[PDB]
Amino acid sequence: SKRYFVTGTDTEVGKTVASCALLQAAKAAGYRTAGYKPVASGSEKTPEGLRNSDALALQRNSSLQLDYATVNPYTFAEPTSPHIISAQEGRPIESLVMSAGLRALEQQADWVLVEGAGGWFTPLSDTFTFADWVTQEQLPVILVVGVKLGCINHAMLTAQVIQHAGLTLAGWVANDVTPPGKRHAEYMTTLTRMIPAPLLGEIPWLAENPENAATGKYINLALL
């Protein structure tokens, strides 16, 4: 069944918003979908336990009715690097558990999207990063680019390292994190030339609750 890992040029660039658009597009295409945020930090308390906002968005945007824990097995309250808070709270992050969770979703979904945490090299332990897990799973990678000054360098750095890891950069998504500025078209042209993967689409600046906006329309899944 189809599976994609979604990474970004940094934290706070639109990975979650773009992942929701991707999931909406896949449901529209007739797939049985599931979003997966194996590791999450920066989460709020509820009577059921901690809930992360990205995991909730992926859950809501999945075509299947999924239990929270199946979407997000590892939830940390403090918004810091996963390895730091995992070591502090004595709750190790295990590659095998992350992988089992992906398999569990595949029991029911035929199209699974996995959202990473932070950027490509976010540490999970003092000796293991998210990039290590993606490499183990041999997942095709989708790069989310928040269109802003500095994004060309970050997109190029991320694409080069993914390629060096022997992984496939399946595509990229442009996300308009701020209102339109002067060199938007020039930036889009530059990124299109430099990133060695198809541009899947562009999400416009959507000030109010973009995670639940109808954004599937901005993604062309036939390019993926």
Ligand SMILES: Nc1ncnc2c1ncn2[C@@H]1O[C@H](COP(=O)(O)OP(=O)(O)O)[C@@H](O)[C@H]1O
């Ligand atoms: N296209 C968009 N339009 C306007 N707001 C955006 C857009 N994309 C992201 N946001 C806002 O920017 C912040 C970071 O987006 P998010 O998808 O959570 O980033 P990441 O998952 O990369 O950390 C959030 O507050 C989100 O609501």
Ligand SMILES: [Mg+2]
């Ligand atoms: Mg975030």
Ligand SMILES: [Mg+2]
């Ligand atoms: Mg996110």
